[PDB]
Amino acid sequence: TWLKKRRWKKAKXP
């Protein structure tokens, strides 16, 4: 499940 907060970006896996 996306989130984007720390290193996270667009939709990425869980």
Structural description of this entry:
The protein is mostly loops. The termini are close together.
Which oligomeric form is depicted? monomer
Strand segment tally: 0
The rounded Rg comes to: 6 Å
User: Could you say which overall geometry the principal axes of the C-alpha atoms support?
Assistant: elongated
Structural class: little secondary structure
Largest sheet properties: none
* Helical content band: under 10%
What share of the residues does DSSP label as strand, in percent? Answer: under 5%
Distance separating the two termini? 4 Å
Features:
14 residues, little secondary structure, 0% helix
Task: Give the secondary structure arrangement, pairings included.
Layout: no helix or strand
In short:
This protein is mostly loops and 14 residues long. The chain contains no helices and no strands. Helices cover 0% and strands 0% of the residues.
